[PDB]
Amino acid sequence: GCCSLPPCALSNPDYC
């Protein structure tokens, strides 16, 4: 999911 994908985690910091 998002939190294990660097580009996604970077854009969704509070979510992760």
From Swiss-Prot:
The record marks 10 as: Important in inhibition of nAChR alpha-7 subunit. The cysteine framework is I (CC-C-C). Alpha4/7 pattern. Keywords: Acetylcholine receptor inhibiting toxin, Amidation, Disulfide bond, Ion channel impairing toxin, Neurotoxin, Postsynaptic neurotoxin, Secreted, Signal, Sulfation, Toxin. Disulfide bonds join 2-8, 3-16. Belongs to the conotoxin A superfamily. Expressed by the venom duct. It is found in: Secreted. The modification Cysteine amide is found at residue 16. Residues 4-6 are annotated as: Ser-Xaa-Pro motif, crucial for potent interaction with nAChR. GO terms for cellular component: extracellular region; host cell postsynaptic membrane. This is Alpha-conotoxin PnIB. Alpha-conotoxins act on postsynaptic membranes, they bind to the nicotinic acetylcholine receptors (nAChR) and thus inhibit them. This toxin blocks mammalian nAChRs (alpha-7/CHRNA7 > alpha-3-beta-2/CHRNA3-CHRNB2). The modification Sulfotyrosine is found at residue 15. GO terms for molecular function: acetylcholine receptor inhibitor activity; ion channel regulator activity; toxin activity. It comes from Conus pennaceus (Feathered cone).
